[PDB]
PDB file of C-alpha atoms and ligand atoms in Angstrom:
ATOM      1  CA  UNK N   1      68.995 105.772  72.896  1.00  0.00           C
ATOM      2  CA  UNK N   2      70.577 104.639  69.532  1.00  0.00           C
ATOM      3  CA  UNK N   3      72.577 107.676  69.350  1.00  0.00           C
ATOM      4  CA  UNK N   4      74.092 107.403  73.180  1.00  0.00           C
ATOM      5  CA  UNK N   5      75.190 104.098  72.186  1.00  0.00           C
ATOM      6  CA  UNK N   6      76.485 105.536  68.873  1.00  0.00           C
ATOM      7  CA  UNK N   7      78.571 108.100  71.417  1.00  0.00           C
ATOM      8  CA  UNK N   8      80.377 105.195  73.281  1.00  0.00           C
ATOM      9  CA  UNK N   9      81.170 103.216  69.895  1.00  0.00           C
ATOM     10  CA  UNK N  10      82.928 106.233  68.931  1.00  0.00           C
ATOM     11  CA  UNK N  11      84.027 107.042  72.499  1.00  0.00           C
ATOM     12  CA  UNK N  12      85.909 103.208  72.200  1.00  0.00           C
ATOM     13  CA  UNK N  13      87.520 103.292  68.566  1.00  0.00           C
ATOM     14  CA  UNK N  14      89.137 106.185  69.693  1.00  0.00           C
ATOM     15  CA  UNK N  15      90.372 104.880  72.767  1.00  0.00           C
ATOM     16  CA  UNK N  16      91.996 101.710  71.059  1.00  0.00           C
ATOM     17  CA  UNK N  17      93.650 103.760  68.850  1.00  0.00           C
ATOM     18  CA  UNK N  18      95.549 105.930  71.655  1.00  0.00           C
ATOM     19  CA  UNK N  19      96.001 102.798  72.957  1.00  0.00           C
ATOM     20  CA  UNK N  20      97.570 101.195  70.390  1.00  0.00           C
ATOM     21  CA  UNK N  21      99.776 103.978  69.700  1.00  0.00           C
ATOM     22  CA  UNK N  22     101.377 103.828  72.979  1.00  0.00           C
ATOM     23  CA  UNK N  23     101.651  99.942  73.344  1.00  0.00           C
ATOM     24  CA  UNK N  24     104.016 100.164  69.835  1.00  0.00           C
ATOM     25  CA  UNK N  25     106.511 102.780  71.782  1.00  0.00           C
ATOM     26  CA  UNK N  26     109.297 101.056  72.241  1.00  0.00           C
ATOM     27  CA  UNK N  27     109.978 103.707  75.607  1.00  0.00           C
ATOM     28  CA  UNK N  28     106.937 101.540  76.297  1.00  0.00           C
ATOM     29  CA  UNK N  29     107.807  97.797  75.863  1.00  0.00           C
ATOM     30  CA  UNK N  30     107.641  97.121  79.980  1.00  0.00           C
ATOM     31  CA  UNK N  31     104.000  98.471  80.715  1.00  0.00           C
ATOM     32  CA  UNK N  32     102.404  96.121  77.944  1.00  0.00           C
ATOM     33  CA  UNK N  33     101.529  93.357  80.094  1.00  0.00           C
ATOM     34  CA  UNK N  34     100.972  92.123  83.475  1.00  0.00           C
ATOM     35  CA  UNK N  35     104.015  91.648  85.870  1.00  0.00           C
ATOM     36  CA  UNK N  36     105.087  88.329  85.506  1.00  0.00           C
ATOM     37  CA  UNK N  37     104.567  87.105  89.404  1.00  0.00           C
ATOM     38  CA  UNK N  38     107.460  84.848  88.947  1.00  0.00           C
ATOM     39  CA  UNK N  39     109.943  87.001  88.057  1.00  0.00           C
ATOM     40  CA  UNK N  40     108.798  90.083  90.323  1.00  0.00           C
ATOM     41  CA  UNK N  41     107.077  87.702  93.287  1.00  0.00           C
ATOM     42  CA  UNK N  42     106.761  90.838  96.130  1.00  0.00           C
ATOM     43  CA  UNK N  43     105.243  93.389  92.900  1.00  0.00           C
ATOM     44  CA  UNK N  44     102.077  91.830  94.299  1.00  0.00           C
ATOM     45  CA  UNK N  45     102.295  92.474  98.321  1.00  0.00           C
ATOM     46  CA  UNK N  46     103.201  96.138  96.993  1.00  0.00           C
ATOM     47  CA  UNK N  47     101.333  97.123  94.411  1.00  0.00           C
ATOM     48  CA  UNK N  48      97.668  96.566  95.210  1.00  0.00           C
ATOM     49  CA  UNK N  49      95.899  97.291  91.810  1.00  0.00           C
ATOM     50  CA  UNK N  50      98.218  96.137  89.120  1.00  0.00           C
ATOM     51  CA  UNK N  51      97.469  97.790  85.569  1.00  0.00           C
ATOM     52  CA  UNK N  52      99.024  97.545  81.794  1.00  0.00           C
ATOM     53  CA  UNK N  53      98.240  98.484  78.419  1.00  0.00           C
ATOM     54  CA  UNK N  54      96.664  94.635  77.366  1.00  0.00           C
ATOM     55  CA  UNK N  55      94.472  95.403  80.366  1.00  0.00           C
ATOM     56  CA  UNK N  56      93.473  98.373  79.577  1.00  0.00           C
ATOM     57  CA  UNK N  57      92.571  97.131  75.426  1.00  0.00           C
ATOM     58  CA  UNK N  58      90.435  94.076  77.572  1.00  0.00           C
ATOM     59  CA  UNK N  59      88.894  96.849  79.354  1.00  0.00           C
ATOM     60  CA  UNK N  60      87.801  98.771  76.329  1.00  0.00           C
ATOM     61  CA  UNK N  61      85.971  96.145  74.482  1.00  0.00           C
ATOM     62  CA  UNK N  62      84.131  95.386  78.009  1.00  0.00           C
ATOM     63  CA  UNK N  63      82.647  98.516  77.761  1.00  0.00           C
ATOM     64  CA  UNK N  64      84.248 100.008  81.120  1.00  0.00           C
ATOM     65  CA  UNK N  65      85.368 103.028  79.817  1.00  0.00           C
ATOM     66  CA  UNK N  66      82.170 105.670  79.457  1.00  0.00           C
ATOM     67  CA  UNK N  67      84.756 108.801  79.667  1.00  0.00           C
ATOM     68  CA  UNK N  68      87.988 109.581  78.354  1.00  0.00           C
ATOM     69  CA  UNK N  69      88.669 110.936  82.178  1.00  0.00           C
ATOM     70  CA  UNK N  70      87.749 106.865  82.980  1.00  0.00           C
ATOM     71  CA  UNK N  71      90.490 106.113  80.393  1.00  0.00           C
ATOM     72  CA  UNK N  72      92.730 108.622  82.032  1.00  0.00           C
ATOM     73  CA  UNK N  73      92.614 107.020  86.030  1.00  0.00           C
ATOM     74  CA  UNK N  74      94.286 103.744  84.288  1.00  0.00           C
ATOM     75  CA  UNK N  75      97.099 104.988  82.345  1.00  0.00           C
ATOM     76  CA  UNK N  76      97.524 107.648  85.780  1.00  0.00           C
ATOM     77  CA  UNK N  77      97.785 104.204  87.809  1.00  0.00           C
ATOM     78  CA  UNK N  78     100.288 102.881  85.393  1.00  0.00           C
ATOM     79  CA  UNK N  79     102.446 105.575  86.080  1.00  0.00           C
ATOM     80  CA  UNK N  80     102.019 105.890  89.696  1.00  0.00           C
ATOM     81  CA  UNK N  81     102.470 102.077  90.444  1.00  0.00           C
ATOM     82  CA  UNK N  82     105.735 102.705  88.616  1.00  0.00           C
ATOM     83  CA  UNK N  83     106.930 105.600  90.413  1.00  0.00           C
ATOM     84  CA  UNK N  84     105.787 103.612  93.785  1.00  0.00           C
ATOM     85  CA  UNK N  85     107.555 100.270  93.141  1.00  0.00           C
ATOM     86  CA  UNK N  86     111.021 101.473  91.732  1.00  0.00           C
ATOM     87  CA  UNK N  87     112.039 105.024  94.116  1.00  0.00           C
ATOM     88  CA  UNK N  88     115.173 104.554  94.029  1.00  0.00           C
ATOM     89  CA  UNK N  89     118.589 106.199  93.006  1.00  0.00           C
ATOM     90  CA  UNK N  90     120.015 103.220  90.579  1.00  0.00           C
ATOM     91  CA  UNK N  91     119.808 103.573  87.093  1.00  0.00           C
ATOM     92  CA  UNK N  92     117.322 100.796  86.534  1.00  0.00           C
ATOM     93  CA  UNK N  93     114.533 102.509  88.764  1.00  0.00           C
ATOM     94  CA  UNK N  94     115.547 105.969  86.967  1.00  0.00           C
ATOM     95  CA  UNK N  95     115.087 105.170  83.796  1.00  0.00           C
ATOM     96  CA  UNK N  96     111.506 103.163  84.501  1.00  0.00           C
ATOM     97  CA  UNK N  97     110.259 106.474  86.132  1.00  0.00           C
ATOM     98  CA  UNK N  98     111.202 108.530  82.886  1.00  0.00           C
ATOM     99  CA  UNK N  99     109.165 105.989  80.922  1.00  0.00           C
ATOM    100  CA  UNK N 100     106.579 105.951  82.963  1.00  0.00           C
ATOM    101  CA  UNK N 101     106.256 109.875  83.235  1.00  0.00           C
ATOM    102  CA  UNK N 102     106.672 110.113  79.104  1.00  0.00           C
ATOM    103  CA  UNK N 103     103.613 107.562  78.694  1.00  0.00           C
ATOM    104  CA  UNK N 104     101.617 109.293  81.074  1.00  0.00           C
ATOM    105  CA  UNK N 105     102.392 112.867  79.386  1.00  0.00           C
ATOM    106  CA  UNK N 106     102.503 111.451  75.578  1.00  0.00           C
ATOM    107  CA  UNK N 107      98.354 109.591  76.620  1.00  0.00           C
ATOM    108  CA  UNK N 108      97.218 113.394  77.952  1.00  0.00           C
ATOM    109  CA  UNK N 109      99.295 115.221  74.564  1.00  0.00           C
ATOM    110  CA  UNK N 110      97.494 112.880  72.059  1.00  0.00           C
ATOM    111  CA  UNK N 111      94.328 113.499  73.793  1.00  0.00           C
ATOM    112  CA  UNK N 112      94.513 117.355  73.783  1.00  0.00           C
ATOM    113  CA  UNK N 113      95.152 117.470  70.172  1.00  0.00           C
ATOM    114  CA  UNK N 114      92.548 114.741  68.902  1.00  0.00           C
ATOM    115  CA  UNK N 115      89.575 114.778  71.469  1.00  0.00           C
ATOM    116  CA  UNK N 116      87.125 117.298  70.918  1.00  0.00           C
ATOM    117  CA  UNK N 117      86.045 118.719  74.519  1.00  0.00           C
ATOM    118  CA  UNK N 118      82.250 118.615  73.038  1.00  0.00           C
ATOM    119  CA  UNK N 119      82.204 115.026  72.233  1.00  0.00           C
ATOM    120  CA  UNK N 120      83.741 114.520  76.015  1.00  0.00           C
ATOM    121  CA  UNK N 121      81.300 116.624  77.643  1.00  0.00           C
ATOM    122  CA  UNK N 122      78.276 114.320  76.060  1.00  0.00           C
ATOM    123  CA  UNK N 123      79.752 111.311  77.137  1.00  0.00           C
ATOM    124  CA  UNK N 124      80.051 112.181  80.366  1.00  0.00           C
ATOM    125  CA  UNK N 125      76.361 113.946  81.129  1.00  0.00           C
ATOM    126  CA  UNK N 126      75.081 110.493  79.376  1.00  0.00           C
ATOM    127  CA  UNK N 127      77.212 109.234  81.865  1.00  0.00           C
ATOM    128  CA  UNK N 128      75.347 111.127  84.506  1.00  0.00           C
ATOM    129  CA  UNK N 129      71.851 110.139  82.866  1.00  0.00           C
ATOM    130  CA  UNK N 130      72.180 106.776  83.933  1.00  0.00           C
TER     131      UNK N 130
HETATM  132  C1  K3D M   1     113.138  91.614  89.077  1.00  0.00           C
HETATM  133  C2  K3D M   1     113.260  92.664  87.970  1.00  0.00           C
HETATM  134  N1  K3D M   1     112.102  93.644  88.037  1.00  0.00           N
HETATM  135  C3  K3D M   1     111.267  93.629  86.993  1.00  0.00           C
HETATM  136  O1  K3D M   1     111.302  92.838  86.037  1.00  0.00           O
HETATM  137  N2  K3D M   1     110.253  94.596  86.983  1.00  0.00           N
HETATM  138  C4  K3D M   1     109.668  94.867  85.726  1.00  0.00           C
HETATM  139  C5  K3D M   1     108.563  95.748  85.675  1.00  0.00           C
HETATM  140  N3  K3D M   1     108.392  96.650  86.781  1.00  0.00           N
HETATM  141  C6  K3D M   1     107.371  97.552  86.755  1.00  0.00           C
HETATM  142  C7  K3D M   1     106.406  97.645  85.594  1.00  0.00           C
HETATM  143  O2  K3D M   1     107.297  98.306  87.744  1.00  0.00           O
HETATM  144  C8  K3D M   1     109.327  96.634  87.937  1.00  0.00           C
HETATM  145  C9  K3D M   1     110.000  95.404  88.144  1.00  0.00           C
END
């Protein structure tokens, strides 16, 4: 119906506008595009679904996103591909893990203030509909 697609055109205005908030963090400079496969050529063998925030905005507008729990399983793989690929004790790999765990916990604060749990639950039993 008119007004289901009415529901995801709100469901995706919202969703680039988390989105943008995050991607103009600077805590959040490194997760804002693809690793560069030249300068990280093993990220690849490693990590087996890469994900970023440019990604994610390409993903929006493609209409992949029906559910802000969607939404949510790509900025949870941003994090975890993070804390997989740098475990170490060094200071570089430290500090990427505390950036990754404060955009993964900033994404799910913004979201309990400013999504209404109604508008979630219709998305998602359209989502069921279909
Ligand atoms: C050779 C230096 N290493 C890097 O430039 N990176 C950057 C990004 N990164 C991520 C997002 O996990 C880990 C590795």
């Amino acid at each position: 119906s008119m007004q289901e697609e009415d529901t995801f055109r709100e469901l995706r205005i919202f969703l680039r506008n988390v989105t943008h908030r995050l991607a103009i963090d600077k805590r959040f400079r490194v997760f804002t595009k693809p690793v560069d496969p030249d300068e990280v050529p093993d990220y690849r063998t490693v990590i087996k679904e890469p994900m970023d925030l440019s990604s994610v905005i390409s993903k929006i507008d493609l209409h992949k996103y029906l559910t802000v729990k969607d939404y949510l399983r790509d900025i949870d793989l941003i994090c975890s591909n993070a804390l997989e690929y740098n475990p170490d004790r060094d200071p570089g790999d430290r500090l990427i893990r505390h950036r990754a765990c404060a955009l993964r916990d900033t994404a799910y604060a913004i979201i309990k203030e400013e999504l209404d749990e109604d508008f979630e639950q219709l998305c998602e039993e359209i989502q069921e509909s279909r």
